[PDB]
Symmetry: C2
Subunit: 259 residues, 2 copies
């Protein structure tokens, strides 16, 4: 049963419907869907355009001489992102200071969602997000979008369920509780199929990466998307509830934690 | 003797290309600036971008009704005839806090440039911008885009030719000298066919209106676009050059200066 034809109300490149064939819960409305991060705290991001590293290409930035391409860290594009073996990977997309055209090949994340997703009711994990088409390894899925808040503010938010940390070693957080995009509905999987990548577009302030999800393997039609929320989340939450990802390899179920 | 010397000065950043032609002289397509399609800053502007305090509507349609709390556009994206073209009020477009669909009728400026424009070499005023199509009165043309700076920083800029004052009353300016869009090339006309309007979209920091040009009459294909730069400019620049607008009632010509 279709409870909403587009939770994004046209804010994304494509519609993101919500269905619930499992239970009585209506299409969630306790948040505001936004497609880009909102700044509701006090931080000053360095947006100084003269600070940007930029390329001088006048092709499609598909050559290895593209300076922006060369700045990528712990990852790189083949045709699709690959990651280095074993600190998160950094992508520097082209920006307003680059000489290239708006439609160069180094603007994947800033160009937005391309894959077909659906918000759906899962059996045991509330709302989740699934792929409606096959998605090859290394494909951009969606950004993790919300309010940029400080570490102090995140620690006192009443609900911690929608936080994503921007951590160097001084930390900032993206809180998708009140304002967020489709990513706020992605569950934890102990068997993850997407990974977060730190991306820079309009600014290159290393304290404030944008978080982009890329597939970590080929994903089949119908599969739930999920990332590894990590030990910080589970060390907190496992004292109240345990993982219901249902994987034969689950690391956070009551059974796995007892053993 | 006009051939395209650049097919798109905006490098595909706008919805339509903006070609550059020169049938007057030997000047090359301007390259002493960086074309950008949204405002930038160098030193920090403390824009208040906090979403929780935005005024916003509760429409769940396309904001074509009378009850949209966000007021000035008609069904076609044009300023309503009531709209005071002499003393423009502020426009608050829809934002991320609004309930409506992205594609609603109150996001005209955020949708960007729709009309065909051309950067061209003028006879007597350097580079200028002209319409390559008819533009009905009250149509959005383009935004004045550049580097946001304080009025105090503007007062010390070496070149003041590309400044635009952001009306609030501390005040700010856009400087399009180093970073700007097609608007940086629009000349002064004493018989202007476009007007600037302060607009708020994603934030409502009243210090930092964004400046949108709307046609003030029906404009014909080929007509040079221009707004009235105003007295702050001519009080300064009259002593360096006179107006070449060619208007019959030109208020800033060698002739008019002489009388005054
Ligand atoms: C960011 S929300 C994901 C969307 C959430 N399922 C919903 O319905 O709104 C994170 C919360 O979802 C639930 N959740 C996510 N992954 C889970 C898992 N593997 N096992 C149990 N609950 C999970 C927990 O309540 C967790 O705090
Ligand atoms: C914002 S720039 C407009 C683009 C400019 N024509 C160019 O070639 O780069 C403003 C400058 O253009 C020239 N200009 C603009 N309008 C003019 C006019 N009506 N008469 C004479 N010069 C004008 C003056 O040099 C003025 O400072
Ligand atoms: C209990 O979960 C969290 C607690 C904190 C967090 C991030 C999470 C995460 C929440 C879920 N999110 C979707 C991804 C995992 C990180 N950042 C934080 N600062 C805290 C520690 C108390 C608030
Ligand atoms: C000489 O022209 C200007 C001087 C100043 C200005 C705006 C203009 C304008 C320049 C041209 N622009 C495209 C439209 C008219 C305003 N804002 C300013 N603060 C000053 C006063 C000295 C710097
Ligand atoms: Zn490049
Ligand atoms: Zn680049
Ligand atoms: Zn590029
Ligand atoms: Zn699990
Ligand atoms: Zn409305
Ligand atoms: Zn609105
Ligand atoms: Zn609206
Ligand atoms: Zn004149």
């Amino acid at each position: 049963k279709i409870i909403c034809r587009d939770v994004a109300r046209g804010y994304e490149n494509v519609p993101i419907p919500c269905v619930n064939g499992v239970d009585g819960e209506p299409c969630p409305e306790d948040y505001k869907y936004i497609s880009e991060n909102c700044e509701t705290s006090t931080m000053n991001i360095d947006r100084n355009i003269t600070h940007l590293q930029h390329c001088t290409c006048v092709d499609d930035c598909s050559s290895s001489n593209c300076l922006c391409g060369q700045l990528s860290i712990r990852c790189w594009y083949d045709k699709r992102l690959l990651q280095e073996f074993n600190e998160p990977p950094l992508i520097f997309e082209c920006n307003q200071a680059c000489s290239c055209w708006r439609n160069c090949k180094n603007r994947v994340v800033q160009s937005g969602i391309k894959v077909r997703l659906q918000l759906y009711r899962t059996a045991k994990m509330g709302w989740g997000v699934r792929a409606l088409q096959t998605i090859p390894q290394g494909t951009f899925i969606c950004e993790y979008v919300g309010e940029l808040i400080s570490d102090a503010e995140a620690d006192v938010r009443e609900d911690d369920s929608y936080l994503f940390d921007l951590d160097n070693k001084e930390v900032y957080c993206i809180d998708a509780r009140y304002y967020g995009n489709i990513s706020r509905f992605i569950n934890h999987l102990c068997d993850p199929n997407i990974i977060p990548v730190r991306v820079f577009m309009l600014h290159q302030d290393l304290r404030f990466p944008r978080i982009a999800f890329f597939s970590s393997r080929d994903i089949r039609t119908g599969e739930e998307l999920g990332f590894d929320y990590g030990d910080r989340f589970w060390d907190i939450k496992s004292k109240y509830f345990t993982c219901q990802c249902g994987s034969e390899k689950c690391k956070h179920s009551a059974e796995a934690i007892a053993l």
